[PDB]
Amino acid sequence: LFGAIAGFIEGGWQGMVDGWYGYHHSNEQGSGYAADRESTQKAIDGVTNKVNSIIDKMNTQFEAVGREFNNLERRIENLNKKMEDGFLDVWTYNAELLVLMENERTLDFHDSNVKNLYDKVRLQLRDNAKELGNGCFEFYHKCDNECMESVRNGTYDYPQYSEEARLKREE
Amino acid sequence: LFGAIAGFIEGGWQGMVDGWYGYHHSNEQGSGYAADRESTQKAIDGVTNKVNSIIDKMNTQFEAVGREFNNLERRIENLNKKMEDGFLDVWTYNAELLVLMENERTLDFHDSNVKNLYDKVRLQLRDNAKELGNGCFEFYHKCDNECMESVRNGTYDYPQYSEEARLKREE
Amino acid sequence: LFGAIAGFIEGGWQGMVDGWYGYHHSNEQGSGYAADRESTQKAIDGVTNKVNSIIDKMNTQFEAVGREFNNLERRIENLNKKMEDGFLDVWTYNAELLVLMENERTLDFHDSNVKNLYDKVRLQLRDNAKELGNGCFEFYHKCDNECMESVRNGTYDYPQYSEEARLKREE
Amino acid sequence: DQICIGYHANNSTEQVDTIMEKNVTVTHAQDILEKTHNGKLCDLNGVKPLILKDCSVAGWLLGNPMCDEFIRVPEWSYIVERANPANDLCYPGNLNDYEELKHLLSRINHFEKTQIIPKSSWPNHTSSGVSAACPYQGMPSFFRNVVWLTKKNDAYPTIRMSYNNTNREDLLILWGIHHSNNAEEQTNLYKNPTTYVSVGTSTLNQRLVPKIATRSQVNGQRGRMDFFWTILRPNDAIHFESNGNFIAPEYAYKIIKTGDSTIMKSEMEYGNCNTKCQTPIGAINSSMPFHNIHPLTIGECPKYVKSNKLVLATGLRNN
Amino acid sequence: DQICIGYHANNSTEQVDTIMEKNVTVTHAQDILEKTHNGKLCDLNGVKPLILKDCSVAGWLLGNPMCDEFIRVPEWSYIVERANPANDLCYPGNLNDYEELKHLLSRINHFEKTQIIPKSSWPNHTSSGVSAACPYQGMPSFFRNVVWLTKKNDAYPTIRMSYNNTNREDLLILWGIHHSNNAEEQTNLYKNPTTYVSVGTSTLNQRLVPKIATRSQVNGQRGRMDFFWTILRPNDAIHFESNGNFIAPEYAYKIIKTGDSTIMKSEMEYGNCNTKCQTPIGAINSSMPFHNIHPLTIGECPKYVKSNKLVLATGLRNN
Amino acid sequence: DQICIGYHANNSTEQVDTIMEKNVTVTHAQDILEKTHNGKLCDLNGVKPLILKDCSVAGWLLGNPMCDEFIRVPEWSYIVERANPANDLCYPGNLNDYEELKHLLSRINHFEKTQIIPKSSWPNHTSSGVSAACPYQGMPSFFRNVVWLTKKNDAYPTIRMSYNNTNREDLLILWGIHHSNNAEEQTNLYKNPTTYVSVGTSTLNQRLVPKIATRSQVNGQRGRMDFFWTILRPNDAIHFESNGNFIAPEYAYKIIKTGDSTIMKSEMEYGNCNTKCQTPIGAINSSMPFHNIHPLTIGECPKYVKSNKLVLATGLRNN
Numbered sequence A, B, C: 001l002f003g004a005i006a007g008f009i010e011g012g013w014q015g016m017v018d019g020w021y022g023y024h025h026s027n028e029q030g031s032g033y034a035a036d037r038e039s040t041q042k043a044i045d046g047v048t049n050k051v052n053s054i055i056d057k058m059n060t061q062f063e064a065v066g067r068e069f070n071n072l073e074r075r076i077e078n079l080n081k082k083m084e085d086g087f088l089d090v091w092t093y094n095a096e097l098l099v100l101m102e103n104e105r106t107l108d109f110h111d112s113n114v115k116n117l118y119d120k121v122r123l124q125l126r127d128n129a130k131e132l133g134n135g136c137f138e139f140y141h142k143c144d145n146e147c148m149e150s151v152r153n154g155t156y157d158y159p160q161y162s163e164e165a166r167l168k169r170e171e
Numbered sequence D, E, F: 001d002q003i004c005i006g007y008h009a010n011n012s013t014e015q016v017d018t019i020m021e022k023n024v025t026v027t028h029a030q031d032i033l034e035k036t037h038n039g040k041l042c043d044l045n046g047v048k049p050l051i052l053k054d055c056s057v058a059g060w061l062l063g064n065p066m067c068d069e070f071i072r073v074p075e076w077s078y079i080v081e082r083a084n085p086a087n088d089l090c091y092p093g094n095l096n097d098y099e100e101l102k103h104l105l106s107r108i109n110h111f112e113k114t115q116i117i118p119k120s121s122w123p124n125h126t127s128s129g130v131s132a133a134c135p136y137q138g139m140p141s142f143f144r145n146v147v148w149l150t151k152k153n154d155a156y157p158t159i160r161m162s163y164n165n166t167n168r169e170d171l172l173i174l175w176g177i178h179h180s181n182n183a184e185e186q187t188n189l190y191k192n193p194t195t196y197v198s199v200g201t202s203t204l205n206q207r208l209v210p211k212i213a214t215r216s217q218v219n220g221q222r223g224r225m226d227f228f229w230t231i232l233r234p235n236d237a238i239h240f241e242s243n244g245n246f247i248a249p250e251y252a253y254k255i256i257k258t259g260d261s262t263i264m265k266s267e268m269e270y271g272n273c274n275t276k277c278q279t280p281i282g283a284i285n286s287s288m289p290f291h292n293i294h295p296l297t298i299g300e301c302p303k304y305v306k307s308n309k310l311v312l313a314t315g316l317r318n319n
């Protein structure tokens, strides 16, 4: 567990319909939601690939053929049924267990993606904003909607806003 | 691996008998240990759930029935023995391997829980304290025992001490 | 995934031939690469141990014996084939699936080791340097090649350089 | 002045399970377990199964007079036999190597029966034999593909006759022997008191002899009939020689299509449906990769598992 | 002024393993492999097993005179047979379909033996047959459940007799035939030189004939006895007819309880213990989910694995 | 002034796969699948296999004249039989319990053939029997290990003879019976019209009788020969008794080494190579833990998997 989903981000957003992960901004021109298209597409790619992997990997399984034995063949009748039952018990262990394990790994995959997005924004902003520790960054300057879009598409010029942020940290 | 247990916290505490994870405080009224029961209960819940899962998953396994064959039935005698031996080799692979894999993931589960607790305190204190990088936070003010209990049960008011911490980071 | 390899460290180094992880330094006496002997030996130990584990655990597998049946024994001939084919389908599921799963965990193991190294020096340096968020620390003082060697072998005296960095952060 | 990182949540109630936590709501699941069937027996790619309602395989192949629907069966996809069919060996006895025959019959999709030895071919013997054990429309009768030879002008001259498989295909040939109850019945039906039936091909070298002894009454008969079968290969010939108790072939089956099939034991009736996946308890219209319906599948089908539920998480934990 | 985050450590030496690292000390393990048994054969929910020390199943069922301890056995939980018991077919020969009979036996828990054909029933034959191959108290004897019929007043009139199963239960019936050594012994014991044994039920249609030929000496006997068995269903009847070499039933076994059991090959002795889990080499008092003791378990038991060690980590790495 | 943390990259193109992502270039892979064989059959730790070329096991064992190369075979490691060998039962018939004999052979490494009953041993019978079905150098011949006894001075006096296994090891003994075509051939070869072959050991009690009837022509013969075998254990004896149609042993096989082997069906030829791992389609010089070559391995070998590729990632993602 990477401590982000249901961790320091104490809940999901009913409001973000475009994707799995993303941003919610609020400046003086209002507020809104924007999904992060690249980290959402990477996750849907890896998860449909994992599902196809599980299905393709249990393609060659076991098929129980019907065989019949008479009243003085009960030994190999019993052998046959314990063999077919054994192979199906085995393959249902395999299926149930693989589903459990990769469900756990899928939930933690999503968790990791969320923490990596939070971090990638943290690294851009540094002391230009204040980590509230709830998943939000309270800016130290004036981030209008172009500035927000920069933060989103990764093109946030840290020098440009240094000075005014520099002062309200002091004051 | 999440780098906390046997990582930047280079050792466990013989002194914390109340739980798996927790806090050790030291102020001028003395020192002590306190287990973090909420993240300890979450872990003991999830790990007894994992153990019960592992036991329940190998409920339907393979039972070897004793069958017998005469001197001109050696072909199916050999078939029978290779079948029973095959199913037992298979199920002991399954058992040993599942134990190994979820032992690895249990150790890393504990690791993650510890790092998430360290972080949960880091986020509360920020620059009011100094991360020594050994698992400890050297405060910048005077945290009596009620200040400590607040840090533990999560109710640490950051405004109240800002000014005072502000000064010895100062000086 | 721990977001370091192919994450905030946007690429590997063709130039570091001596090991898997390590440092690249640049001061006024020049630049260079130095692998981290410790973290690298730890990983090569754990991964050759994992490989030997995977090989040794598939020691007792299934061995197919050749049996033969006549024209009025087609029922148990078919039984025999379904049994041997079933056990081989089972063990190739086991092999391919174990390889896939521990390949994923090996890649993420390497990732974790890298993040733990980045962190281990971050914890040494604190505000004496500036995390560029690209995997590098832009120092705030004068780190000659023995200061660098200290950072590498872990012996970095934070007091000694505080004062000087203290100014070049201000100014 | 703020910006936050967050993740999807929605109304979804989809639960998935893990080793650590059960009943975990997620935003996007995916079921991979098909758990519904149509409770009917269907075609298989538009090929109707052979459903021997109330007639067993022995009764069909030997020609029980109650099995007259199956005189000329068309090509089938699979065969459906009931649990305890009523019409099977009206005259009591055995179809020897029956299970091996059913296993052979599960790799055959089309018979064309053919008359290898017409009743016209027994000038010196009586071929009108008939039994009360095999009623047809209230009168005694007998298997339709096989002839009960008896004495004529109070003689059973020894039969020496062969049939050479001129056809392209393999031939399934059934014949039999009759175990009489005592010396006097044995002499009444055939004149000769100690008899035999010899059958020879290129692989087969059989000598059968009546066991004249007292048995329990079954279908009103203490006598018995032991039937045998072989696969006469093309250009090979079969050589019968008897002096009593011989039950001769008249009709044999040309094996003309030999693809993939099974003999499925279901008590169910035809459904007028079609399917790509049939099971004893119903068919399957599904592109799930698994089902829990029945293990004895036939056709292009998911893989049978015993689980009650299999859902893969694709999304995030939701609240 | 300080506060730190840390984790448990203690004295524990419990090691666990992982794919990356072996012999890893942890604070809290959990063993799930039972590796201990009591080396004894016990009751199974208070029901004592049937231990045929030194008598084999054939010797028991036919009534070897050294097996008199098992004349009237009480209900059992499982059956314990030794690897090479001494008392088994004193008169040499075969119990035909023996393995199928033992497989039938491991699903029976209680026989009640019953006298279907008393020795009183052979007015025209000698029923006192006895062999040196079957000593009892130093004198020659014979199987107790089965009667060696021989000639009387230098005649062996042909036997025609039947037994009708009036009982509620299935009947396990054994009979046999005797292979003599030459024409002269054949005439000494039975007058008729060429003989037969005919057996008929509703399913069975047997004719046995003595093989009079020279064999190797076994238990001091070149003659042989071939024994056969069947399950006579309630209201069905069995019809014997012989004129020599017949070894007739006297006692049959009512199958009165038909639950679950096994035939366990152990050289061990009774332990006066009780258990819910029995193995050939000892019983198991354990609520572990696995054991490595023996694969051929009986009762509510852990699941057999070959491992020497299975420990689940529940706590943290400890130092 | 700067210091950075980084990781290895190199030229490597080695790809590995995972559940989430396929075709992931890494810096350090490791192959664990052996996919190469030498396409030829070799020694096995310097012990040459027995390669019956155009002779089947039956042919070799009975002593078919074309299989004269295996008169006295040296110790083998495994046995190689072709898919459809030409020299097998020149005189048509059956080697009864053939499959069980092959299974017994797959656990034997060395026979020493021995003359238990020389042709010298039949003073009152003709032992020169010979058939056109078994040509040798253009003239009719017969199995070399087994003798066709026929009448002499127009008599076939009944045979009574035994052989006591004095050797220290088990003996594989084959004998047979001949099914003639009609009463007059039966009288031409043996004077007596109705005959038998009795075989007895301490365990075996066989009576064979010719089935004189008309069969299909096979290798120019409507007659047949049914062969049987047994393992005469040391100090036990075998007792033959016939008055016609007996085909007697002359040579038997001492089972002198009884290790580990298999009967491998390969059409291939000897390779003059050596190996520690042989398969039907070639041998293996490899220390990989897996292969995908062929399932029916023999020797110290990797474990067969059906996979086409198996590489474990050991290094990092590379670009």
Ligand SMILES: *[C@@H]1O[C@H](CO)[C@@H](O[C@@H]2O[C@H](CO)[C@@H](O)[C@H](O)[C@H]2NC(C)=O)[C@H](O)[C@H]1NC(C)=O
Binding pocket: D164, D165, D166, D235, D236, D237, F216, F217
């Ligand atoms: C079965 O009948 C066919 C029909 O003729 C026989 O086939 C002939 O066999 C002879 C061998 O003597 C060949 O030379 C001919 O080529 C075959 N004739 C045709 C038209 O193909 C066959 O021999 C008979 N077999 C038996 C066992 O009676």
Ligand SMILES: *[C@@H]1O[C@H](CO)[C@@H](O[C@@H]2O[C@H](CO)[C@@H](O)[C@H](O)[C@H]2NC(C)=O)[C@H](O)[C@H]1NC(C)=O
Binding pocket: D216, D217, E164, E165, E235, E236, E237
């Ligand atoms: C065995 O004896 C019983 C005698 O009870 C026979 O059963 C009777 O069968 C008649 C039909 O003939 C029925 O009326 C009754 O149901 C039976 N009688 C009783 C009292 O239940 C049975 O037929 C005999 N079986 C054989 C093979 O002789």
Ligand SMILES: *[C@@H]1O[C@H](CO)[C@@H](O[C@@H]2O[C@H](CO)[C@@H](O)[C@H](O)[C@H]2NC(C)=O)[C@H](O)[C@H]1NC(C)=O
Binding pocket: E216, E217, F164, F165, F166, F235, F236, F237
């Ligand atoms: C086969 O011959 C051996 C001797 O060559 C027989 O074994 C002897 O048996 C006698 C008793 O009859 C005892 O003196 C010894 O037990 C054996 N002697 C030796 C020297 O071994 C054996 O009985 C014969 N087998 C048959 C079936 O006749």
Ligand SMILES: *[C@@H]1O[C@H](CO)[C@@H](O)[C@H](O)[C@H]1NC(C)=O
Binding pocket: D022, D023
């Ligand atoms: C999980 O949810 C199902 C849904 O009804 C319920 O029946 C079951 O009892 C639950 N089990 C647990 C352990 O929560």
Ligand SMILES: *[C@@H]1O[C@H](CO)[C@@H](O)[C@H](O)[C@H]1NC(C)=O
Binding pocket: D123, D124, D157
């Ligand atoms: C049998 O049929 C043949 C040919 O039809 C004939 O020659 C003969 O008279 C008949 N009767 C007997 C007993 O052969």
Ligand SMILES: *[C@@H]1O[C@H](CO)[C@@H](O)[C@H](O)[C@H]1NC(C)=O
Binding pocket: E022, E023
């Ligand atoms: C692990 O510890 C046991 C304790 O006896 C020892 O026998 C074994 O050799 C050790 N194995 C390794 C790989 O350390």
Ligand SMILES: *[C@@H]1O[C@H](CO)[C@@H](O)[C@H](O)[C@H]1NC(C)=O
Binding pocket: E123, E124
């Ligand atoms: C013995 O045989 C005679 C003649 O068949 C018969 O009357 C008698 O009843 C039989 N046994 C006895 C004495 O009951």
Ligand SMILES: *[C@@H]1O[C@H](CO)[C@@H](O)[C@H](O)[C@H]1NC(C)=O
Binding pocket: F022, F023
């Ligand atoms: C993976 O690489 C192989 C290499 O040839 C290629 O054939 C295959 O199509 C690739 N698969 C995918 C899913 O890209």
Ligand SMILES: *[C@@H]1O[C@H](CO)[C@@H](O)[C@H](O)[C@H]1NC(C)=O
Binding pocket: F123, F124
């Ligand atoms: C062969 O026959 C002669 C004369 O009957 C007899 O003396 C001799 O013992 C017989 N040989 C055998 C092997 O019995």
